Amino acid sequence: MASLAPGSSRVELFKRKNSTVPFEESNGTIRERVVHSFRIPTIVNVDGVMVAIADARYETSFDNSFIETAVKYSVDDGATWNTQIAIKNSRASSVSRVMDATVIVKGNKLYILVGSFNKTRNSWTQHRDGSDWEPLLVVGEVTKSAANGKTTATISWGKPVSLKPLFPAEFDGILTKEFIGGVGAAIVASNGNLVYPVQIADMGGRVFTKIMYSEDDGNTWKFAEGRSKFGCSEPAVLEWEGKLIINNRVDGNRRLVYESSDMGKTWVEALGTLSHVWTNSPTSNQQDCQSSFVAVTIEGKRVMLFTHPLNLKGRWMRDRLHLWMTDNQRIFDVGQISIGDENSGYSSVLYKDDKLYSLHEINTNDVYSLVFVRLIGELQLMKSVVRTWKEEDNHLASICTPVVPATPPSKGGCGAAVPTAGLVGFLSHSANGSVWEDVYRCVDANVANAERVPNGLKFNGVGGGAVWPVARQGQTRRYQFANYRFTLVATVTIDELPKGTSPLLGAGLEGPGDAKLLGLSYDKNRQWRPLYGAAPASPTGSWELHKKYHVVLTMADRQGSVYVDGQPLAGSGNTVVRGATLPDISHFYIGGPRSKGAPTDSRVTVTNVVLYNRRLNSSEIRTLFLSQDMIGTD
Ligand SMILES: *[C@]1(C(=O)O)O[C@@H]([C@H](O)[C@H](O)CO)[C@H](O)[C@@H](O)[C@H]1F
């Protein structure tokens, strides 16, 4: 429940202990051979032909067993498939194996990078040296042919080539041991380069990721200078707005995401967007899982698709495969694409000719099949959401804001546009007694003791207010960016005087006590009480009951400011977080929500709460101050 959507369906395409593969004997005779388990799915489109790539783990599902690379391919979008063994293992031993295919499509060619092992019984990261290993590159060519109106295809697979001679003996003076591809679909960059994210094991047994790329269609390969932190594995890469985005598996902690604007030379952790959003299980202390990570264009908008199990059962069970869609600002949970509480695993997603598919593992008793899934209901919802995103951004960007003294007398006589770049969430008119709906359909705020008003809520009662969850999102922390930077905006009225001080808007911190990163309170003397981290919150300024004010909280570079009516309150611009440890914001609070502790009852009305993943600039703050009556969804 939350599960493969109505409209969608699947088949067991690579059927454990059932589907055969054309195993080639040493003498060249072909034998249709049953396969215990099919693992490590990738599905891609090569010039109209679906190509599904998988480990055929012939005898057992163990990693260090007899494995070859299987392919199934279809010219009729999966009505029918032909089956190959694309890549043979060395046949050196009973555990000879080509493993963990990583695939790039360029034109009618598939570039497949696999690890190849002869006799080791333990895993690649654990080997004493690289002697049992070769990284093999194989090129497949897809040829389509039509005759009597019947399209068919063949795929020819080149002889494997070892890239072992190209593997540096060290990086930063520490010796390398082995590398393999990051698993799954990799890319051709807009400059034509073949870009593989790779996993490197050093002679110390540590692992990290790097980009290995080719400028000449695989004739030569270069390892770019940058790398992940140690502990990152199975990286997936896409290209977004001129950067590589490298999304890493991280066993036992949250997933690190890096960006590189220079073909891997320099990596910067994506603290302001996607890093640490996703994780391996609710508690983050479990073995992680491979994920697909693909850029697609849906309804005219470029988005990234990401698949990962929730792994509520933990370990390698990997139940509850989800698909997320993000425009690098908003992050939408498309839903669970596996069925019920079944164990899934590694996955792949493909958008081809305006249809969405997945190829993913299902696991019963550690026997694995690959299901081929028609994500029909999922695509419908995705298109709806992208339309919402487009419609709202367009709407906001089209508002004619008031001219200001240095407006360049422009078109329509408007001031600067309402900012939409980095606009992550927006709470406005749509709400009920318990939910304040994110206009962008990703993260609702939870509400208590509220009454609806145009564009927001009026709070009256114990814990009257809204909680916009940050760390409180739980496993997938879509607002993790806020720990690095944010702007939070709202229009407010104070409806009744507080007894002493009462909360209005801010960012709470995880931990005991009642700590806030940045926020605003108000008091019985009709002063504001901005809260700048742990600093004693000194009253300042003046407000009137019933009057609408504009509130902006900005935090970036560990500095916090609080603006009322487009002007900073005393005490703004200083450091609100100390250390080089990111804050852990629990939630944004709007009004005085609480479920425990003091029975706060902030009698305020808040409308049009906007959240950005960056610090708005002075022009943008002014624009919002001047356009408060223009942005609401009522
Ligand atoms: C995958 C898995 O099922 O967890 O794990 C990797 C590997 O064991 C981990 O990345 C730890 O190094 C295997 O290579 C992969 O085939 C698959 F089993």
Automatic annotation (TrEMBL):
Enzyme Commission code(s) on record: 3.2.1.18
GO MF term list: exo-alpha-sialidase activity
Entry GO terms, CC: cytoplasm; membrane
Residue pairs linked by disulfide bridges in the UniProt entry: 400-414
Keywords from the named record: Glycosidase, Hydrolase, Repeat, Signal
Domain of life: Eukaryota
Glycosylation: residue positions: 18, 27, 118, 432, 617
SUPFAM superfamilies: Concanavalin A-like lectins/glucanases, Sialidases
Gene3D superfamilies cross-referenced by the UniProt entry: 2.120.10.10, 2.60.120.200
Segments passing through the bilayer: none
Listed name of the protein: Sialidase
Organism: Trypanosoma rangeli
